[PDB]
Amino acid sequence: MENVVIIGSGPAGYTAAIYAARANLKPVVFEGFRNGRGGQLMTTTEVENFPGFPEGITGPDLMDRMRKQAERWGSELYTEDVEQVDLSVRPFVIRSSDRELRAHSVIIATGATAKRLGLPSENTFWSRGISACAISDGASPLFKNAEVAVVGGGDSATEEAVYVTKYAKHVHLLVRGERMRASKAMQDRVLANPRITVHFNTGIEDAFGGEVLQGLRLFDTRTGEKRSLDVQGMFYGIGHTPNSKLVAGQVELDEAGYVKVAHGAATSVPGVFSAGDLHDTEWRQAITAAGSGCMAALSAERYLTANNLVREFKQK
Amino acid sequence: MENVVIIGSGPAGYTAAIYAARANLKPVVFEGFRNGRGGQLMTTTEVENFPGFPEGITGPDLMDRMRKQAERWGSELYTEDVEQVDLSVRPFVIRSSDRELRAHSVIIATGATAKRLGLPSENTFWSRGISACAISDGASPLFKNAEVAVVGGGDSATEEAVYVTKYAKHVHLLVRGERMRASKAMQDRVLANPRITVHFNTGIEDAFGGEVLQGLRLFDTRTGEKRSLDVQGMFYGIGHTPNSKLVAGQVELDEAGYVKVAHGAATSVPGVFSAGDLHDTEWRQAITAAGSGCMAALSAERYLTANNLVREFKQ
Numbered sequence: 176m177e178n179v180v181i182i183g184s185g186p187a188g189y190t191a192a193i194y195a196a197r198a199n200l201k202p203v204v205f206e207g208f209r210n211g212r213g214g215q216l217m218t219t220t221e222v223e224n225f226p227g228f229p230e231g232i233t234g235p236d237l238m239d240r241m242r243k244q245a246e247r248w249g250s251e252l253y254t255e256d257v258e259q260v261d262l263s264v265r266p267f268v269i270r271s272s273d274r275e276l277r278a279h280s281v282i283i284a285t286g287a288t289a290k291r292l293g294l295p296s297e298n299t300f301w302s303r304g305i306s307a308c309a310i311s312d313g314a315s316p317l318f319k320n321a322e323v324a325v326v327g328g329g330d331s332a333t334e335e336a337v338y339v340t341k342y343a344k345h346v347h348l349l350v351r352g353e354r355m356r357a358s359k360a361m362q363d364r365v366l367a368n369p370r371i372t373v374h375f376n377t378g379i380e381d382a383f384g385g386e387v388l389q390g391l392r393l394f395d396t397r398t399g400e401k402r403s404l405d406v407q408g409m410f411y412g413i414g415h416t417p418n419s420k421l422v423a424g425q426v427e428l429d430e431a432g433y434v435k436v437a438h439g440a441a442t443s444v445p446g447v448f449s450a451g452d453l454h455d456t457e458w459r460q461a462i463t464a465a466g467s468g469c470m471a472a473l474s475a476e477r478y479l480t481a482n483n484l485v486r487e488f489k490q491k
Numbered sequence: 492m493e494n495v496v497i498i499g500s501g502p503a504g505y506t507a508a509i510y511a512a513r514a515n516l517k518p519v520v521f522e523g524f525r526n527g528r529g530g531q532l533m534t535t536t537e538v539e540n541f542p543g544f545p546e547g548i549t550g551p552d553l554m555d556r557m558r559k560q561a562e563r564w565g566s567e568l569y570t571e572d573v574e575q576v577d578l579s580v581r582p583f584v585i586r587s588s589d590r591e592l593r594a595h596s597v598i599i600a601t602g603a604t605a606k607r608l609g610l611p612s613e614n615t616f617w618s619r620g621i622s623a624c625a626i627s628d629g630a631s632p633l634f635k636n637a638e639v640a641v642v643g644g645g646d647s648a649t650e651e652a653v654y655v656t657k658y659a660k661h662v663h664l665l666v667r668g669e670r671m672r673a674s675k676a677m678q679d680r681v682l683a684n685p686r687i688t689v690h691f692n693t694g695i696e697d698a699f700g701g702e703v704l705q706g707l708r709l710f711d712t713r714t715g716e717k718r719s720l721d722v723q724g725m726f727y728g729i730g731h732t733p734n735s736k737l738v739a740g741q742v743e744l745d746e747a748g749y750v751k752v753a754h755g756a757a758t759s760v761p762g763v764f765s766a767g768d769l770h771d772t773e774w775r776q777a778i779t780a781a782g783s784g785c786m787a788a789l790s791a792e793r794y795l796t797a798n799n800l801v802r803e804f805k806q
């Protein structure tokens with residue numbers, strides 16, 4: 176029976192595993208299989224803001240590093256999707272289709288996946304013209320001094336559009352509806368910025384290009400009339416999905432579905448800790464998610480010690 | 492006049508610089524000179540728990556990487572000690588020995604230095620037998636199934652002594668006074684743990700060894716009698732000093748001197764943000780300090796944008 180079970184193999188889950196493993200807890204990590212082992216960063220090619228890599232590092236390369244680090248210090252890694260978590264009994268029950276474990280503490284780090292549009296060619300230009308994170312990719316050479324589209328109509332999209340005027344020559348805010356939904360302040364910010372053109376009643380049919388994004392096929396959401404927009408970048412600003420389905424109804428969540436935490440990583444259920452984007456509505460970065468994994472691991476270790484629950488394992 | 496001024500070049504200051512720079516804010520970093528460019532990790536040789544380095548990385552090598560990354564994206568780095576911070580005027584004034592700058596926002600990331608004993612041979616065996624961080628170094632090969640001393644008598648030392656029984660064969664808790672000062676619960680853990688021997692009225696005269704720590708010169712703090720203790724590791728558990736002297740009286744601090752923060756990095760003075768060990772009484776890790784630097788940078792960027800203060804620089 177397990178000291179700790181960690182659900183997730185993004186930056187937060189592996190950092191939690193590293194700390195838990197070095198604290199001799201022999202953590203079990205359910206990394207995800209269909210949910211994507213290694214997390215959201217597996218779908219990006221350039222990480223420039225993760226401190227310690229001044230030449231950049233690809234997303235897969237950083238997560239391959241993290242995974243080995245978790246294993247080196249004693250982590251038990253399962254490339255498996257968890258299907259069920261029962262927090263109404265102690266020890267807790269964690270079930271993947273392949274196995275059922277009991278654990279004194281659980282760390283849930285399942286992320287908050289950024290909504291995508293699902294355009295026919297999206298996979299082609301993903302990370303080569305299309306991104307979901309302006310803070311991360313906006314500084315990229317691909318968009319330097321170039322024309323970029325920002326998709327959405329809420330506070331997220333208006334915020335991203337303002338942010339990418341830091342690097343782009345001109346920014347096209349594509350709003351599917353008749354009017355924007357953001358606050359009056361946000362819309363005012365946007366309409367007072369001469370580098371943003373707002374297109375209303377505009378939907379996206381596809382992206383086109385060669386090796387990198389070169390434009391968009393649009394349509395008017397009123398007439399269906401088609402129109403092409405030349406752009407070399409496109410940012411999605413259509414929100415986020417916190418992946419809390421496994422603990423919905425069992426731990427406190429906010430209205431959008433994020434896990435509520437205090438003291439860094441404590442959920443409303445003692446023994447359950449959250450790490451990463453799953454509870455973070457402010458930052459949504461790899462470095463902060465890693466920091467959150469450490470907090471969650473250090474919290475679990477203290478929790479276990481405070482209740483004399485630690486099962487003893489040592490280094491190999 | 493500056494968008495943001497960052498005070499400190501540990502993990503938290505550089506991560507704040509990386510984010511601020513990539514947000515085209517051209518941040519100014521006062522890295523410290525007498526306070527040590529590159530932070531506390533400059534004094535350790537093996538960092539094994541910073542995610543992304545499965546083979547380990549020395550402290551100097553990780554910080555040299557961070558510094559370069561701060562510069563690549565537009566950071567303005569000064570190897571200088573800040574001597575004064577005036578938060579009673581806007582924009583704020585930050586004075587080093589060489590220069591005085593105004594700034595719309597300040598990120599103070601000055602750390603919390605782990606107290607050392609200052610033993611004659613301390614520098615010799617430091618990071619080759621002596622550490623202040625059990626979470627970081629306890630798993631080190633140097634202490635596997637070895638006898639280790641833990642110095643102190645408060646809650647910090649007793650928790651560390653229990654923590655290092657995870658790896659050491661036996662732990663000698665060296666207490667200078669007649670009694671432990673930790674809580675009754677902490678003392679109970681210690682006295683009910685058969686792998687810990689508590690030495691009272693025990694002070695340390697020096698450490699000895701060859702290439703790695705081999706023992707301790709002790710004395711009784713009552714009779715002065717000397718006694719040698721064989722150990723291959725020693726952990727200091729004598730607390731921490733948050734480096735808030737520059738903002739003392741100006742931003743809210745707690746009783747121990749840590750900066751009070753809310754919303755990740757916001758201090759009591761709008762526009763002033765704290766990152767790193769300077770405000771963290773719970774974790775005190777490089778990865779969390781880095782995470783805190785990002786929060787502070789993202790907070791400053793939004794603060795400046797929210798007040799139409801951002802001055803334009805590009806890549």
Ligand SMILES: Cc1cc2nc3c(=O)[nH]c(=O)nc-3n(C[C@H](O)[C@H](O)[C@H](O)COP(=O)(O)OP(=O)(O)OC[C@H]3O[C@@H](n4cnc5c(N)ncnc54)[C@H](O)[C@@H]3O)c2cc1C
Nearest residue numbers: 183184185186187207210214215257286451452459460461
């Ligand atoms: C295109 C794109 C580019 C980005 N670029 C950057 C960048 O350059 N720098 C940066 O700091 N941030 C970047 N981000 C944001 C960054 O990806 C996130 O902040 C980071 O991944 C959060 O880490 P996390 O571990 O909390 O969540 P995730 O990385 O999403 O990890 C979630 C993990 O939980 C697993 N999981 C989910 N459900 C289950 C289940 N039932 N059972 C088992 N396992 C499960 C998943 O398989 C996955 O491994 C980018 C995001 C996108 C979309």
Ligand SMILES: Cc1cc2nc3c(=O)[nH]c(=O)nc-3n(C[C@H](O)[C@H](O)[C@H](O)COP(=O)(O)OP(=O)(O)OC[C@H]3O[C@@H](n4cnc5c(N)ncnc54)[C@H](O)[C@@H]3O)c2cc1C
Nearest residue numbers: 499500501502503523526530531573602767768775776777
């Ligand atoms: C021996 C030892 C080993 C450790 N090993 C690890 C490990 O392996 N992994 C881990 O995660 N953590 C480790 N730690 C803890 C880790 O070092 C800290 O958590 C981390 O350094 C804190 O980061 P920081 O940027 O907030 O503070 P610091 O690294 O302390 O940075 C403080 C910065 O502020 C500068 N500064 C201070 N005052 C001024 C001033 N007036 N003007 C200008 N600049 C100023 C200083 O020069 C310095 O650069 C170790 C600590 C010690 C003591």
